[PDB]
Amino acid sequence: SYVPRTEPAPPEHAIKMDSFRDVWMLRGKYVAFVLMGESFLRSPAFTVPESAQRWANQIRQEGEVTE
Secondary structure: OOOOOOOOEOOEOOEOOOOOOOEEEEOOEEEEEOOOOOOOOEOOOEOOHHHHHHHHHHHHHOOOOOO
């Protein structure tokens, strides 16, 4: 489908860093890809990897509304 797989940029295409689940280095920052349904909405990119990871896992399991 639409697949918002962003656009693999030269300075940072889709660097999975070190297997961080849903955290890929985009534009130098850490973006997350995971939606509650079937899409893939990207995060505003955080300077901290775990900050984007947690938000990604929460919006996935709880689907936006955390518990």
